[PDB]
Structures are given as C-alpha cells and as structure tokens.
Amino acid sequence: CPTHADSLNNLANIKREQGNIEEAVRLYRKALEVFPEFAAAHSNLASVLQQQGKLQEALMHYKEAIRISPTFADAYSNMGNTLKEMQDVQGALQCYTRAIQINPAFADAHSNLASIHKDSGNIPEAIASYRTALKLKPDFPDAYCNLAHCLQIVCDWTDYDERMKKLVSIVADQLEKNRLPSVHPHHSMLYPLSHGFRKAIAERHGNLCLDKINVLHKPPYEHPKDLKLSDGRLRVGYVSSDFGNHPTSHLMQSIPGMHNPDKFEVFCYALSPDDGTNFRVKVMAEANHFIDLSQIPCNGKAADRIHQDGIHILVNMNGYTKGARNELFALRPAPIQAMWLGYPGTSGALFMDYIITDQETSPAEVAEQYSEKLAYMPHTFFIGDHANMFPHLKKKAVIDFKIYDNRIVLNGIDLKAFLDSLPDVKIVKMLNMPVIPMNTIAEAVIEMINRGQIQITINGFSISNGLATTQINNKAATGEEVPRTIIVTTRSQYGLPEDAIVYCNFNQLYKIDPSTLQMWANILKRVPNSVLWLLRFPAVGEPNIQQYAQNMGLPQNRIIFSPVAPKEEHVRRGQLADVCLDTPLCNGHTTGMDVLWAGTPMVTMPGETLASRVAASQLTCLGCLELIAKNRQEYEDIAVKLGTDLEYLKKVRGKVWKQRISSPLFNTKQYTMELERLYLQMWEHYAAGNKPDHMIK
C-alpha cells in the first residue's frame, strides 16, 4: 500500500524535523514493511542512519533506492553526503554531479557540491555553487551560512552589514525552533552573535555526538577513585587528530616528554594515522604510551580502550575541528575531561568538565560564555615549542649595508663561530647584536641574494639563502629539524622597503574584517613611511583586500603580499617586520607565538570571546602590557607611536627580544610543571567526591 507507506513516510519526515530520530527510523522502517519497493523511504531512512553514524547501512539503502528508481535525484545527492563523510570525495562528486544532471534546479545538490569545492580550496567555485543554490531556494540556511564563510575566507565583504544581520537572524530562528544551527561553532567567533548564541550553537553541535553514541547502547563507565592501580601516578590521556605536522604539535610536542614520570603516566591517543614526520616520531617515542585510535574506527571499542587504560584525566585537543571524535568524550571513559589548547572556544557540551585557560584569556566575569568550569594556568594557557624547534633564532646578527636590526639578518647554530672568523665584527649592546660592516664578506652575501643563489661558503661556513631552504634541507624547512647552516634573511627577498616601517600580520585572511582593515588604514595614513605586510592566505583574498584598501585611500604599493612559506621561513622572516598588528576579530594564536619568537612587538585589542583575547594573554605573560589596547583609538595610537618614535620602537623591540627568553612564555619545562599542578588540583577535587568547579583561585 503506497498510500499508507506514504503517510508513514511523511510522519517520519515530521519526527525527523523535530529531532526525534529514533521514531523517524522506526516509521521509515514501518513504511518499508508496508511498501518494500518504496524508494523514498529507503533514501530517507538512509539519511537518518547517516546521522547515527551507520554509514555502511545508509549506503546499502541509498543503493536500494537507486535500484528501484534510477533517476532518483534526492537519493544521489543524499548518497553523496554519506560518501563525503566516508572521505570518498570522488564518489561524492560523482553523486552530486549525477543529481544535478537529473534535476538542474536541485538546490540542495548545488549546495552540497559547493561544500566539496570549499573543502578543496576552490572558493570561487564554491561561491558560485552556493549562489546557484540560493537562487533556486532563497530560504536555505546551510547554503547562506556556508557561503558567508566562503566570503569571509577571501575577505569579500559585499553587503557585509546586511550579511551579518541575516546570519544572526538565521541562528536566532534555528535556536528558537530547536534546529541545529547552520553556523559552525568554530566560525561563530567571527560573527556578531551574542555569547549566549555562541554557547548554544556549540551545545547543539555537542549534542549531535549523542545521536552517534546512543545506538551503541553502552552503560556508564566506572571510574578510578584513587591512584593505587597506577602506583600513585596520575594517568593523563591526550586525544588529538594532530600528532604530526600540524600547529597543535608545533605548540605542545615537547610536553608529553617533559611530564614527571614520578607523578604522571602519559598516554597519547592519536585520531590520525602516522604522517611520517618527526613530530609524530617525537610524540610516539616520548609519551609513556602511544595509541593509534585511527585503527579503531568504532567509538565504542575506542572508548573501551581509553577506559581500560585507566585514564584519570582525558584531554580534548580538537573541540570542533577537522578530525575530532568527540563521541569518545561523550562516552565519558574518564572521570575528568578537559578542553585544552586545540580549540579556541567552549564545547558547550555536557561531556566536557573543564576548559584550561587563564585569567587574561577568560576572566571570571565571562564565565557565562562557557559550559565548562574555568581552569586557570598561572600565566597563559598558550604555549609553543619554538625554543626547541627554532633555536637558531635565539640569536641574530645583521649586516650594516649603509644600524637597522631588521633589514639583513643572519641566524645560525654556528653563527658565533662564523662571526669569530671575521676581523671586523662590531657589537651593538641592547643580549646584544653583532654587526658585520659593508665589507667583502657582506657584498658576497648580498650578491647571493640578488643573484638568487642557493648558498655560498665563507671561511668554511655554509651561508644559505633563506628563500631556498627546501632545496637545502626540507626537514629544516618544515621545522622537523634545526637548520645546520647560517641563514640569510632580507627585506629585499620579499620586496619590503629598506627605509620604511613594516607592519605585519601573518594570519589567515579570514581573521580580518572591514573594521580591522580600516584601523590598519588609519595607522598607515598617520605613518606615511610605512607598509602593511600580509600573506596570500589564500591568494584570492589579495585583490579583495587591495580593493577595500585602495577605496580607503591607500595606494597598492602600501600593502605588500607574500606567499605562505614553510614553517621555518615563516617564523624566521618575522624578524624583518618592525611591528605586528594583531587581528581583533580572532587573534593570532600559533601565529602570535610565531611573531613573538622573532622578537617582533605585537599590538592587540582584546575582545570578549576567547579567540579575541589570546594575544593579550601572550603579551601579559611576556610582560608587555604597553602593547594591549583597550579600544580602537588606543590600538591605533600605540601602532602609530611605534612607527614614528624610533627610540620607543627600539626599546619595545629589545623588551620583546629579551623577554621571549626570560619570561615563561616559551618555557615548556615550566609550563608542564604548572600544567601538572593544575591536573593534581582537578584530581584532588574529584577524589574528594566533588563535581567540577572553577579552579581560578
């Protein structure tokens, strides 16, 4: 009876919309009992199975739907979504393209196709496909919100104010109607949403995990209530998809090995396979235990492994980012579960207990922005492995080509030995800065740069062109190894002015908004002799930024773009800037640590969101409060002072140069010890029978 089955199918659709997925599944199945050859019920059932993470069962039903109805466009598009989740991009594309072939006006299929282009880095095509979707279906929250993010990525600010208004209105409607918001939690920081809206977005995404673990029918775990089974050692589990060549590893790769084996037993749970890098090698060798959970795709069996390991504190380093398996945390295999470092915001999730942060980043008065209890590190929660990865940058020398500290820079593990081989090296006392006069050796180096040569030899020492690192040692370029040569870095390599101030920002362009570019333009106009240095991150954002800047009155030559560089070159070339202008919308995080390691002062204006306050936290730890602006006028005033008062610039640069070493900011040994003290606070609290509470002293 297709008629009765149709009624059941429609009722299932309604239940599905209401978030009652179990009842929907039951009804679709009943529809198939009444009408076994019901293509629509097969396809609709598959979609809810997909929601429950039953991907192979979903595929089976999609294929059944298409067997019954070979031109069933909805089934193809829906099947494409499942293949995409399965990491079969070619298959997904084949499905979406088939769906559009059948129905040229299939809005959802155009939007789903767009998502592939977006993920591939083809933003213009994503934008085109999302626009087609919105033309065919103007009320389409998923397409609108994903289009908004595409535009954000390339700094396309067309109708920006109205766009933000609509995003907020969409989210409000979805929240009121109990639907999953079309704005991703990780992106919510970029839009003028209330803190309440941002937390509610995160909460609802957190709840999706339950759809995927509910079908596992697992009981609650019994947790350890003491450290007896572990010989008085606290078992800490670090869970991350980013053990390998990823910013997360560039920040914390040293921490597992630095933990005190007398008090802690460290387990690292990798959600990704071995990428073959030294980052992966290091963590695997230095953790007490290393577990490749990428080999255990079932979250149930994977959670079982974590529980059976006896983990006391399980640490979520992904939050809502690519590669996350928050389902593992939803199963609570550990008695205490903490967010740390990898995700700049609240999980909003029932299954997370704490967020490790700090007083500057997350002041107590903003506790309402987070579902987790706040757990303060004593300085900043941020950390970086720069002192271990890039020790060649601890010292520098310059060439006096006329004394600037940032026009022609030398760095090298054997730099002092090289300098000692020269008869005429002078010192500028700040540690202090050796200067090579404009001699035969200096011309030799400059010639190498101008001739585009890869490297030369002087007094037995290899002197490398900083633009050619991948040709000399690719491991040194990625940061897997410390470069063994003396490296030359020059403003001329990047087309930077020799006789003007360079303001830089090396972040992905999506962190810039109209208000920020306007601030920057205000600074440039007040400091005639200056340029802004940005990255093609991505390159298609460049012409957009240029257009807005030109319209603000800045000629094209005041904004210099460089390509994204290998890790080592990126950190090293920060030495060429005078000042970094931080993005207030979302700060540099890793990027902030990168620029400070070069000794480059960073001007920041902290906001209310965690992501907007990290840079100020870094600077507070560094001991440079003069770089923290309370408002737009001050941000501008500070940057302008640094660009016009060269004696003040010199003093602030010296402060950063010294304090990156003397302060706790890059001190991983110290950080780890403080992290441990915090872990023990959490444990003692739990062992006394307490639920989580703020650890903010």
Partner: peptide, 10 residues
C-alpha cells in the same frame, strides 16, 4: 570539513 544538507523526500 564543511557540513552538507540531506534532502527529505515527500
């Protein structure tokens, strides 16, 4: 990892 849209067939 950009999310997608399932179509409910009536």
């Amino acid at each position: 990892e950009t999310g997608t849209t399932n179509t409910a067939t009536t």
